[PDB]
Motif scaffolding. Structure first.
Motif, mmCIF file in Angstrom:
data_model
loop_
_atom_site.group_PDB
_atom_site.id
_atom_site.type_symbol
_atom_site.label_atom_id
_atom_site.label_comp_id
_atom_site.label_asym_id
_atom_site.label_seq_id
_atom_site.Cartn_x
_atom_site.Cartn_y
_atom_site.Cartn_z
ATOM 1 N N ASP A 661 0.883 -1.186 0.000
ATOM 2 C CA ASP A 661 0.000 0.000 0.000
ATOM 3 C C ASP A 661 0.910 1.222 0.000
ATOM 4 O OD1 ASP A 661 -1.840 1.986 0.473
ATOM 5 O OD2 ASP A 661 -2.575 1.123 2.390
ATOM 6 N N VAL A 663 0.836 4.427 -0.498
ATOM 7 C CA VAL A 663 0.486 5.746 0.064
ATOM 8 C C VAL A 663 -0.549 5.486 1.145
ATOM 9 C CG1 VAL A 663 -0.480 8.020 -0.292
ATOM 10 C CG2 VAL A 663 0.923 6.960 -2.111
ATOM 11 N N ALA A 664 -0.248 5.828 2.366
ATOM 12 C CA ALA A 664 -1.147 5.522 3.485
ATOM 13 C C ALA A 664 -0.936 6.518 4.614
ATOM 14 C CB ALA A 664 -0.972 4.099 3.960
ATOM 15 N N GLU A 710 -7.708 2.421 2.883
ATOM 16 C CA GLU A 710 -7.835 3.753 2.280
ATOM 17 C C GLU A 710 -7.886 3.627 0.765
ATOM 18 O OE1 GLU A 710 -4.330 5.295 4.168
ATOM 19 O OE2 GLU A 710 -5.541 6.180 5.768
ATOM 20 N N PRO A 711 -8.755 4.417 0.092
ATOM 21 C CA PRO A 711 -8.761 4.397 -1.357
ATOM 22 C C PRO A 711 -7.397 4.812 -1.900
ATOM 23 C CG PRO A 711 -9.949 6.352 -0.515
ATOM 24 C CD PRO A 711 -9.585 5.498 0.676
ATOM 25 N N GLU A 713 -3.885 3.432 -4.647
ATOM 26 C CA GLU A 713 -3.154 2.377 -5.324
ATOM 27 C C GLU A 713 -2.830 1.241 -4.348
ATOM 28 O OE1 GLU A 713 0.648 3.511 -6.856
ATOM 29 O OE2 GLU A 713 0.853 1.672 -8.087
HETATM 30 MG MG LIG Z 1 -2.997 3.700 0.088
#
Ligand SMILES: [Mg+2]
Ligand SMILES: OC[C@H]1O[C@@H](O[C@H]2[C@H](O)[C@@H](O)[C@H](O)O[C@@H]2CO)[C@H](O)[C@@H](O)[C@H]1O
Ligand SMILES: OC[C@H]1O[C@@H](O[C@H]2[C@H](O)[C@@H](O)[C@H](O)O[C@@H]2CO)[C@H](O)[C@@H](O)[C@H]1O
Ligand SMILES: [Mg+2]
Lengths: 733, 733
Positions: A661, A663-664, A710-711, A713
């Motif tokens: 994930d 980007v978080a 989370e929405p 990629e």
């Molecule tokens: Mg993410």
């Protein structure tokens, strides 16, 4: 229910003395001599026994219950970790099978054999995540991955308990060690554990929850502090989390002397205050130290605990006995009173075919230069090293009722395989250690290591003569099982120096050198990876270990094991594990600079990564394809790849799926295992592998412990180890 | 206040472009060529400069401000860590002085020299707690203890900032690295930090709070994650804690490219989102990557940030410049417009007296068999090893504007001390490393290590001939400074192998062997403690290091340094530190069980404990006496001991007070430092030492971060190190 009515009616009959007696778990020992223990059982002052493990001995205890007022039956427990009498590989070796059915088989047979001897309960599975190879108990877990260890935790519980806990071939699982025990600082056993709540919830707690959700009847509490609070006194852990949040309805059991150890931890100044802390935190059953029987009556009379604290603890013990069938028949695992006597250790009561088949699956081929393996059953083979003829070591640590004399050594497995078609030549070569202080440690309590009294030089010259007379050398080297056991933390992850001196001298002969490694933890193997011609990781492979090892060495079985814990290049890199965070300044193949997160005095990354292991054949994966570029909430995604055997021998490999994930709201790991498929293929066979991914695979605990996906990629990686992958991306809406 | 009025009136006049320009902190270099940067300063696009360090260069930049609309002056910063031009010992060696006045003198002179060159600000002090010897930045801190590091954090800030930040010889302290940077997992620089809140609050955060409460004008934000959240994006850390809880009113400064590094951490997918996260977390000033100037206008126009985010950040920059006096006179540290030019690096501008006096105080005598030290100025002394003639290494890492050619080597210091009274014989003996990959790393940017072209064997034969021609051998060995610097994490804590081969050959000559160690971290010294006749730890002792070292070796100064970080026996024991928890199964050094928290393959505990260090004289302590057995709330307890010099030479030692809270609602450390007295005594002198303790000394953070003292027993320990103490108890009511 009938169960809650039965339990309430029984508890309405019981004095507090009788209720408190139910909480007492003891073993025969110096602290509890047999005759005194039998008198206490007759008095209703014992709830359960551990470490009594044969039908006649267990029947004799259960017989004493008939003399008490209420005749409440005992349960009997033991440490059936990786086998009862037929010993399977250590758990870290079972995990390397990557096959829940192999792991289930080991647990099922263990339960069959333990219940056949009258046991009702194992203190198993051990499901502590381990990221620090120095800890001696890494041999008891399933390695470093939360996904895999969580899956295997549930498999072990289901296999032990069957469809009915009252079945005579079932045992109750007491999942251990709740919690975080394998994060000990410094890798020193029993040491401080300190970690963030997001790390605890995301990575370390899920295996215990998987056991609870699989229906484990019991939880064994750990010996360590968690963020300053010993688990044994940790009401947040044992009550708020385990009962209120997770809904656990079973029995909590203290570890051995753990209630009294609250004084050494500095939580209590005396045994009375320690007892109060443990029972109010949520510890039901008190192992060995007898503090509950000594102090609960005084505490209650002083108003320092509530009647509800005793009642909760007693109800949990009675409910475990109810589920085990012991109120319906206390002798249900003990046969009939006039069954003829028998030999507990008879050959016909073992399960050697299951042990040999399971042990083959865990063996990991780490190196195989120019197709040296598999060997032909011919010529002159020198079998050299202190582990070659060791029955005590091949069964591993926590070997339960395993009998070393019943075990197959590596030497004997090779002798069995070759019969008269090849000549074996033996030399011990070295003692397991050349450091007398380490031999003194390993022979403390029980003489577990045979010390050749010759000088190191005389042993080496004998081994060099043997190697010079042979076509090739099988060196059987590594750790003795007491080096990878409770309290045996190591500061060095190499093969012991006496044995590395042996290997360097054997290399200098020019004979092809095959290393057969025994060990209970990751080892630092840089010299070996450079110099050995082949390396087979065999962990401690159990009662049939030597036969399973010969099966692989002679190509009856194509090695299929893969690592479930990263092998550091040295102890100075600890910890290394595959699901680490990127940092702001990553060092990897794409970020090789000076000003990165790295060491300068050694090569970086593990020597062998998570999921690594070779084969006698070659495998090919087609390009990874996802079923769509976008995933709606509530939907499932498929990841498809075709696996092919592109070599000349049948064999299995393990296709691994990882997620990132990128980007978080927290920094998330560079990869996290989210699926796998072990596949056996003939040469030129293909299998389409379909992985399913949903939102549940994508969630994490944020800084506030919200469990969120989370929405954005996600990257999906597939490959045959954690280092050799490719990715495709999708977007969660 | 005049400052609030001045800033409000100036900000009411400013465009958003001007406010955003104030947030930009840059250096001349590849990314910002000098002439382009000068044009940006003229346009009001630059708030501050770092790494421009001479009066003519700084004045030239300040002259460009006259061209901007509001003429807001720059401030100029630098990494003045342990000296500007006159280099003091590295911080870990300054801490070993245990003398707040010596540490203050180093900071004051640093500020005098930096402000004399036109600098306004140092990125100092570094106050990160370090318990992992592998980390290359341990050289920059004060060791492992929270009390001592907190004390010295406040001392450094007050010494830099003086009685008035507008004074021309004051500089602003930007305390770093907020926060927890030295807890990097694996000791790998920049790596993940994960810890409980009780540990964070009790042990890691107090040094940063001490700097804030001493009035530090600025805070430099760290590069690491804290429990998954990069410090640069951590609103809890920079806003809730630093501003709302601690009341910090100053400037937060990002680290170098830290805003852009939020992409690599996986918190942001692009530079716009990274900018938003940093400014809303509470990062005021953006170092080098220019993300703030590129993205803040677009973020504001999209409503993705608030005007108050820009206004908060700008107000903090203007407030720093106000306190530095730069609105009253932008040239207050830059002299007059017609001042004559001068040589920045003139000898006359150095502070060699202060460097020599300071450097004496931190040297730690670790071993001295049969009074070999102090040496007499007579006979023939062999001076051997790669650090003996090293000017670049004696000034250490983070040596600011220090000039190696101005430094006194150990060889030259001995030459100065003996004059013609003794004969020195020199041989290099070995290169710093035998590993060409390590030498290429150390020389990768600049020539930092002289590689003797001779073979290792030729250097060794020369050294053995030299040793045979001498009465005794002073071996000057250890690390080069690039081994203990940013990103230089080590997997091995020993002296480098090339040098250990030299030491073993020197031992075999039978000549008395004195080791002079240079290093930036604890080293593993088992062989040395067994075989050397004497061992002096000199850290990297700075521009006068060689003279201070000769002062101790010839007994002009009686060694008085004591360790502030535990020296592990090997890297496989990390972490080892003195204020650890007992565990439920502590190992006893006097009766050591197998089933305890320990390693089996090495001796346990540090080789040298916290607070250890020898003297050329002997000291005695009388029995510890407490003023009472019971302490009422709000009252003071006195702990008294008499120290005597019971030997033949004047000298100092450090009397240390430790507290234990043996029963608490968290497991508390076995001891914690709570006071000390450094005492210089002539032979036969005595000093009554009086420690005062009250409730504030007895509080701790519990599981819910309640910060109170619980009634019950406290144990008081006094001694000359953490291991050799005497103890008495009292009860808090
Ligand atoms: Mg993410
Ligand atoms: O210390 C050896 C001693 O340990 C006792 O306690 C075990 C417990 O049985 C087991 O389930 C847990 O995993 O480890 C405990 C030790 O930390 C055993 O009961 C006793 O037989 C010995 O093995
Ligand atoms: O990476 C070398 C590079 O670091 C830059 O940033 C420093 C910063 O100046 C200093 O205060 C901090 O302690 O370490 C940062 C690197 O982690 C320097 O500005 C630049 O001069 C180089 O030294
Ligand atoms: Mg207390």
């Amino acid at each position: 229910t009938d169960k809650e009515r039965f339990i309430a009616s029984l508890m309405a009959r019981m004095s507090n003395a009788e209720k408190i007696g139910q909480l007492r778990l003891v073993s025969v020992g110096a602290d509890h001599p047999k005759e005194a223990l039998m008198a206490d059982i007759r008095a209703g002052k014992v709830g359960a026994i551990f470490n009594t493990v044969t039908r006649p001995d267990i029947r004799a205890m259960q017989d004493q219950v008939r003399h008490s007022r209420l005749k409440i039956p005992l349960f009997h427990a033991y440490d059936v970790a990786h086998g009862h009498r037929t010993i399977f590989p250590i758990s870290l070796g079972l995990a390397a099978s990557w096959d829940p059915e192999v792991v289930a088989r080991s647990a099922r047979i263990s339960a069959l054999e333990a219940s056949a001897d009258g046991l009702d309960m194992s203190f198993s599975p051990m499901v502590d995540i381990t990221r620090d190879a120095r800890w001696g108990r890494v041999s008891e877990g399933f390695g470093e991955d939360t996904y895999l260890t969580s899956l295997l935790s549930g498999v072990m519980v289901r296999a032990y308990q069957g469809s009915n806990l009252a079945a005579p071939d079932s045992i109750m699982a007491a999942v251990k060690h709740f919690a975080l025990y394998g994060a000990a600082e410094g890798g020193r056993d029993y040491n401080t554990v300190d970690m963030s709540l997001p790390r605890m919830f995301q990575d370390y707690l899920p295996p215990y929850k998987a056991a609870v959700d699989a229906g484990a009847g019991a939880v064994m509490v750990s010996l360590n502090t968690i963020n300053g609070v010993p688990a044994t006194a940790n009401r947040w852990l044992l009550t708020d989390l385990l009962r209120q949040q997770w809904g656990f309805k079973g029995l909590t059991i203290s570890n051995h002397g753990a209630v009294k150890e609250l004084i050494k931890h500095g939580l209590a100044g005396n045994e009375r205050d320690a007892t109060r802390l443990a029972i109010q935190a949520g510890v039901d059953m008190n192992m060995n130290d007898d503090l509950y029987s000594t102090w609960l009556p005084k505490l209650l009379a002083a108003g320092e605990i509530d009647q509800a604290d005793i009642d909760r603890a007693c109800r949990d013990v009675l409910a475990a006995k109810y589920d085990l069938g012991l109120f319906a028949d206390p002798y249900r695992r003990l046969g009939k009173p006039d069954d003829p006597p028998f030999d507990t250790n008879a050959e016909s009561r073992l399960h050697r075919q299951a042990a040999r088949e399971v042990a083959r699956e865990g063996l990991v081929l780490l190196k195989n230069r120019d197709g040296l393996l598999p060997l032909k059953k011919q010529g002159r083979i020198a079998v050299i090293g202190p582990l070659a003829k060791s029955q005590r070591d091949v069964i591993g640590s926590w070997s339960a009722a395993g009998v070393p004399r019943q075990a197959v050594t590596v030497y004997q497995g090779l002798a069995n395989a070759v019969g008269e078609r090849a000549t074996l030549l033996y030399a011990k070569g070295a003692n397991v250690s050349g450091d007398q202080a380490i031999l003194d440690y390993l022979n403390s309590y029980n003489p577990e290591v045979e010390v050749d009294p010759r000088s190191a030089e005389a042993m080496l010259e004998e081994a060099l003569r043997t190697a010079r007379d042979a076509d090739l050398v099988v060196a059987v080297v590594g750790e003795s099982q007491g080096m990878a056991h409770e309290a045996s933390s190591r500061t060095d992850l190499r093969i012991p120096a006496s044995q590395r001196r042996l290997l360097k001298a054997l290399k200098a002969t020019g004979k092809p050198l095959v290393l057969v490694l025994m060990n209970g933890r990751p080892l630092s193997l840089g010299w070996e990876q450079e110099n050995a011609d082949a390396i087979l990781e065999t962990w401690f492979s159990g009662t049939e270990g030597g036969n399973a090892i010969a099966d692989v060495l002679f190509g009856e079985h194509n090695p299929s094991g893969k690592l479930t814990m990263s092998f550091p290049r040295s102890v100075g890199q600890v910890p290394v594990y595959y699901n680490h965070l990127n940092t702001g300044r990553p060092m990897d193949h794409d970020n090789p600079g000076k000003y990165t997160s790295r060491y300068f005095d050694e090569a970086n990354g593990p020597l062998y990564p998570f999921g690594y292991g070779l084969s006698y054949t070659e495998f090919s994966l087609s390009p990874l394809r996802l079923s769509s570029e976008r995933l709606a909430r509530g939907a499932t995604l498929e990841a498809r790849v075709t696996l092919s055997n592109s070599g000349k021998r049948a064999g299995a490999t393990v296709v691994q799926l990882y997620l990132q994930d990128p980007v978080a709201s927290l920094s998330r790991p560079v990869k996290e295992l989210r699926g796998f498929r072990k596949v056996m293929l003939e040469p030129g066979e293909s299998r389409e592998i379909v992985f399913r991914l949903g939102e549940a695979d994508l969630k994490f605990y944020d800084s506030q412990l919200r469990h969120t996906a989370e929405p954005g990629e996600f990257k999906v990686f597939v490959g045959l180890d954690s280092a050799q992958t490719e990715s495709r991306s999708f977007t969660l809406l």
